[PDB]
């Protein structure tokens, strides 16, 4: 993607 800052809070859920 050309715009990224957060990789979803879902990634912290594992």
Rounded Cα–Cα distance for residues 2 and 12 (Å): 22
Query: What is the DSSP annotation of 1-14?
Result: ----S---GGGGT-
Residue 8, Ramachandran bin (φ over 0: left; ψ between -120 and 50: alpha; else beta): left
Q: Which two tokens stand for residue 4?
A: 């990224």
Rounded Cα–Cα distance for residues 4 and 6 (Å): 6
Experimental method reported for this structure: NMR
Task: Give me the half-sphere count of Cα atoms (radius 13 Å) on the Cβ side of residue 5.
Answer: 0
- Tell how far CA 3 is from the center of its chain: 11
Task: Give me the half-sphere count of Cα atoms (radius 13 Å) on the Cβ side of residue 4.
Answer: 4
CA angle 2, 4, 11 (to 5 degrees): 135
Rounded Cα–Cα distance for residues 11 and 7 (Å): 7
């Amino acid at each position: 993607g050309r715009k990224r800052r957060q990789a979803s809070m879902t990634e912290f859920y594992h």
